[PDB]
Design a protein around this ligand. Structure first.
Ligand code: SF4
Lengths: 289, 289
């Protein structure tokens, strides 16, 4: 019943916002959901709590001395729709692998039996910028089963998306770690919907949603809350409900097929974000050409 | 004579472009420089080599079996102005700390006596997104002495700049690792020049340069080359020469003074990128307000 899910993707494309907003649609339709905040900024829970920045397991363990001197009630908060929220906390600048904050944070929650407490969903909001051993921690430790990659029709978000996938693949043979699909966050670039579906099937998954750039997300997030919470009778709000729908309904859980550099640039050139570079101009000064 | 330098800063603000371009200015004014490519994409050497993507120590060790089956001549290339170039290589997606690629890469170069070979400069192009143990590796192993942080008048690039600094500070007491200054890459935001000098002196360093958003950089980089190489008699070109000038001349090497979150938002609000948020609208639906 209780599924183990993760949201992976790069920063600056509104990953957390779509994660939180999704989780809110999912709460209002009956489910009890818990978000684990694996990003080094506390932005993973912000909108559900109406918080400036939630208290994290790292800064609080730094407080009470050790990780066990914390009580569950202090780290794990609940906001909108009784959505349980924790921020894992960043690696202490200079020292500390990021992924070791996350084991600390999951371990702590297993031992205070939050996982065995009545729950339908867990959602790890995870940075999928570089996929190092550190950010791969939910996948290697098999705490995330269903991976949904948020991305956009833009080079880095895509490369990012592929890499997340190569990680899924590393731990294919070890367990139930699978790519459930790609969510596109629009950047009002032309061909981006179908570019992300080109990528989605060339990987062997779908593009389970397309999230439109609606200026109500901005207006709801300045009030530190979801769009499902701010204006439930909105266009965008039903988009979040629709995504959240497709997610329960998803049965499509796969081991992906990473593509190469030339193949990513292929897809980037034919939909138009990338240009066909000229070979004769290369290495030549404006003197020359 | 041979100074050990590093360029730290976040992605997507044109760090490598300014690194490479700087290094070119420095080359035409007589010096012999080597760039070490610590970013997971091969973008750190690209413009000096006119290469699509240079061959990295990770993918080539994966080729010959072990790191010692590689010959110096294969990894270390030279381009414009006899600027020696290597790409370190990323962590293999899923497994591998990023910083362990970098020790491998430096170690390999110490042993084939590239460091003892006549050289005035070494420049580690390093991602300073999160400052984990992994990206702190040049600082903990004291291979970078002079850190220059490229940033912009934008929240994340500044936060990032602060964190790089907290890392400098961790290894204050261990050696000669010092913050030489902040380089601003313009994003044609109003107050950004003086915002980065606010930040610069609130940290205890200067803003050793301001690099203007000139559309010749774009036109030179599409030809896979520097602006010093493409059009030497250009406005931007002299900017790179001027930066490179101030760098030799720099004597100002410090241990920085990291600022807080409230202090960062202070500076963001008074120069105008950040807005003064309203307290009464928070937590309230459009029904309510
Ligand atoms: S695995 Fe990655 S998160 Fe951990 S230290 Fe290494 S580079 Fe940082």
């Amino acid at each position: 019943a209780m599924r183990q899910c993760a949201i992976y993707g790069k920063g600056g494309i509104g990953k957390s916002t779509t994660t939180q907003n999704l989780v809110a649609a999912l709460a209002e339709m009956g489910k009890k959901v818990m978000i684990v905040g694996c990003d080094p900024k506390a932005d993973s829970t912000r909108l559900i709590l109406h918080s400036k920045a939630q208290n994290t397991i790292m800064e609080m363990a730094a407080e009470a001395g050790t990780v066990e001197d914390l009580e569950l009630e202090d780290v794990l908060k609940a906001g909108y729709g009784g959505v349980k929220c924790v921020e894992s906390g960043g690696p202490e600048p200079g020292v500390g692998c990021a992924g070791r904050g996350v084991i600390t944070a999951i371990n702590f929650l297993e031992e205070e039996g939050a996982y065995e407490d009545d729950l339908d969903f867990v959602f790890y909001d995870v940075l999928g910028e570089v996929v190092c051993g550190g950010f791969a921690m939910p996948i290697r430790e098999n705490k995330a089963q269903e991976i949904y990659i948020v991305c956009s029709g833009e080079m880095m978000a895509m490369y990012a998306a592929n890499n997340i996938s190569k990680g899924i693949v590393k731990y294919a043979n070890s367990g139930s770690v699978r790519l459930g699909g790609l969510i596109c966050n629009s950047r009002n670039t032309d061909r981006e919907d179908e570019l992300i579906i080109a990528l989605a099937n060339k990987l062997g998954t779908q593009m389970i949603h397309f999230v439109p750039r609606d200026n109500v997300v901005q207006r709801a997030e300045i009030r530190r809350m979801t769009v499902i919470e701010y204006d439930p009778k909105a266009k965008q709000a039903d988009e979040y409900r629709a995504l959240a729908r497709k997610v329960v309904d998803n049965k499509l859980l796969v081991i992906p097929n990473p593509i190469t550099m030339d193949e990513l640039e292929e897809l980037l050139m034919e939909f138009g974000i990338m240009e066909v570079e000229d070979e004769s101009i290369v290495g030549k000064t404006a003197e020359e050409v």
